[PDB]
Amino acid sequence: HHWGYGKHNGPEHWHKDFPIAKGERQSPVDIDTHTAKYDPSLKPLSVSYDQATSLRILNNGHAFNVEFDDSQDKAVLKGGPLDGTYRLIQFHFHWGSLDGQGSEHTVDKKKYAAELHLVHWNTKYGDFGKAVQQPDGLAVLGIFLKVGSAKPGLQKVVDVLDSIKTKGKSADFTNFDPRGLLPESLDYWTYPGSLTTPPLLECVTWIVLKEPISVSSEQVLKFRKLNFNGEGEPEELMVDNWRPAQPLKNRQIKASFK
Numbered sequence: 001h002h003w004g005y006g007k008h009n010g011p012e013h014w015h016k017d018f019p020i021a022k023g024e025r026q027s028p029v030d031i032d033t034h035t036a037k038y039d040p041s042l043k044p045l046s047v048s049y050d051q052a053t054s055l056r057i058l059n060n061g062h063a064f065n066v067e068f069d070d071s072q073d074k075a076v077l078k079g080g081p082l083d084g085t086y087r088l089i090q091f092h093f094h095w096g097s098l099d100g101q102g103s104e105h106t107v108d109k110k111k112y113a114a115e116l117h118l119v120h121w122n123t124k125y126g127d128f129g130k131a132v133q134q135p136d137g138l139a140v141l142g143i144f145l146k147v148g149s150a151k152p153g154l155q156k157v158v159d160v161l162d163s164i165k166t167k168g169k170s171a172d173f174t175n176f177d178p179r180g181l182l183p184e185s186l187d188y189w190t191y192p193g194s195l196t197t198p199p200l201l202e203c204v205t206w207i208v209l210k211e212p213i214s215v216s217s218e219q220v221l222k223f224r225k226l227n228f229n230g231e232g233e234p235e236e237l238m239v240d241n242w243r244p245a246q247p248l249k250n251r252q253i254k255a256s257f258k
């Protein structure tokens with residue numbers, strides 16, 4: 001009876017095995033654009049992905065992860081609200097069964113069709129496992145996806161999904177350049193939060209880009225053909241693998257733009 005996104009093991013049930021689900025800085029949250037405040041102390045955000053080395057892609061029964069070699073500073077995020085260097089370890093998406101839902105963060109309650117999470121860990125902690133024991137151990141760069149024109153840089157990902165249809169399957173996935181998933185502007189909102197899937201650890205500095213990327217209906221439709229179940233099991237389409245917005249509580253969301 002492991003956590004998932006169904007009626008019986010979904011978001012409303014997570015608190016039983018992971019009490020921190022009702023914690024003080026859970027994610028995602030709704031971003032009230034009018035209440036967010038421009039912060040002049042934010043340094044410019046630096047996304048340096050030119051040396052990124054992707055390794056493989058895996059369906060873990062919740063989403064699919066594109067994993068990177070994080071044994072050296074090859075793809076890093078720095079600046080903005082961060083102190084130090086954060087190394088890219090993997091990226092994944094959360095999407096819906098329909099275009100009107102799918103994102104985890106919302107903007108003035110508006111839901112996008114999907115959301116990309118590029119996960120990074122603070123290099124001062126030595127590794128991912130150690131970073132998730134720290135309040136500033138992780139930085140996740142979130143990018144909204146809306147349905148419109150196709151995103152060329154996402155097609156390589158789309159085309160390999162047929163090979164990892166079910167839970168547990170993985171495939172070689174080298175030379176994928178994450179720069180192809182970035183919108184033009186780096187304007188963003190930032191707030192302290194958590195992982196949005198169990199263990200829901202509160203170690204994340206969230207950086208959510210204001211500008212969404214556009215993906216085609218055909219690209220998102222292929223995400224929805226994936227399976228939550230393992231091979232040879234009854235088919236449960238992988239859709240709506242998003243956690244709804246959580247209480248903001250004692251937090252202020254800062255904007256990098258006026």
Ligand SMILES: NS(=O)(=O)NCC1=CS(=O)(=O)c2ccccc21
Binds near residue numbers: 117197199
């Ligand atoms: N939506 S989210 O971004 O909070 N989730 C990310 C996540 C959760 S994890 O601890 O399974 C893990 C292991 C390795 C790399 C990333 C992750």
Ligand SMILES: [Zn+2]
Binds near residue numbers: 092
């Ligand atoms: Zn995520």
